[PDB]
Design a protein around this ligand. Structure first.
Ligand code: NXL
Length: 261
């Protein structure tokens, strides 16, 4: 009830710019707030990159087990998993899991490289019907989050539709969809974001993101108790380049959405 008033009031109180897109798969209804504005994706772009490698593995049948060299020069700003394997190798499956569940930025860059560069991630988006997503840069510069810059952005509406296709539809093969869902459900970084605004009995798979301009993001597939799943994108960015993160705003948006159902 009064969901637009509530989302607008949350945004005004926060001082920033909030983007929300919900898909309720029980009845195909949607809730949108700035659903067609571009937002910097930051680490949420890793879902597209992992899904694109999963799609490649549908025809390169051993691709996920292929070793990839991790060198000291490859390390960037946040490499919790890759730093354990420097001067050795990690498989593409291990890199996908590290990128999704620990938000390892070196693992992300290896996914991007496997795909031929950022354009290869965008090409996969286009191949599954997403005409809005764009990846332009590698880690860490994809997180600059400069206002008005279209690089490394998407809209909430597009990314909710794509996450639905990837996790509940048929953009990926059956086994690969299940693998993506398993990875998202095992995310380690999400308890303060969308999940925090939902009843604890519901099951969530998600991927968070953060960047400059206090950018605080989360994209999630949600299995409520006793009812069909939801897909929810909450993107948030702020006026000051050095702004603090606001995961509480994402949780509040999810809480508003959960009471309106
Ligand atoms: C992704 O947005 N990033 C990589 C890592 N993500 O952790 S988060 O998903 O918990 O925010 C650190 C922050 C961010 C980056 N590299 O700036």
């Amino acid at each position: 009830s009064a969901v637009q008033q509530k989302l607008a009031a949350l945004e005004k109180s926060s001082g920033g710019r909030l983007g929300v897109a919900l898909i309720d798969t029980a009845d195909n209804t949607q809730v949108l707030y700035r659903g067609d504005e571009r937002f910097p994706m930051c680490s949420t772009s890793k879902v597209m990159a992992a899904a694109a490698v999963l799609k490649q593995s549908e025809t390169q049948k051993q691709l996920l087990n292929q070793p990839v060299e991790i060198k000291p020069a490859d390390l960037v700003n946040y490499n919790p998993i890759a730093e354990k394997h420097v001067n050795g190798t990690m498989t593409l499956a291990e890199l996908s899991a590290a990128a999704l569940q620990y938000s390892d930025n070196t693992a992300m860059n290896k996914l991007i490289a496997q795909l031929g560069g950022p354009g290869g991630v965008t090409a996969f988006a286009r191949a599954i019907g997403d005409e809005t997503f764009r990846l332009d840069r590698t880690e860490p510069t994809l997180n600059t989050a400069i206002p008005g810059d279209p690089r490394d952005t998407t809209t909430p509406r597009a990314m909710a539709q794509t996450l639905r296709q990837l996790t509940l539809g048929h953009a990926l093969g059956e086994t690969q969809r299940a693998q993506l869902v398993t990875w998202l459900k095992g995310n380690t970084t999400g308890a303060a974001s969308i999940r925090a605004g939902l009843p604890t009995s519901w099951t969530v798979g998600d991927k968070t993101g953060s960047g400059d301009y206090g950018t605080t993001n989360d994209i999630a597939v949600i299995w409520p108790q006793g009812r069909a799943p939801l897909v929810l994108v909450t993107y948030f960015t702020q006026p000051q380049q050095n702004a603090e993160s606001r995961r509480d705003v994402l949780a509040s948006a999810a809480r508003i959405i959960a009471e309106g159902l």
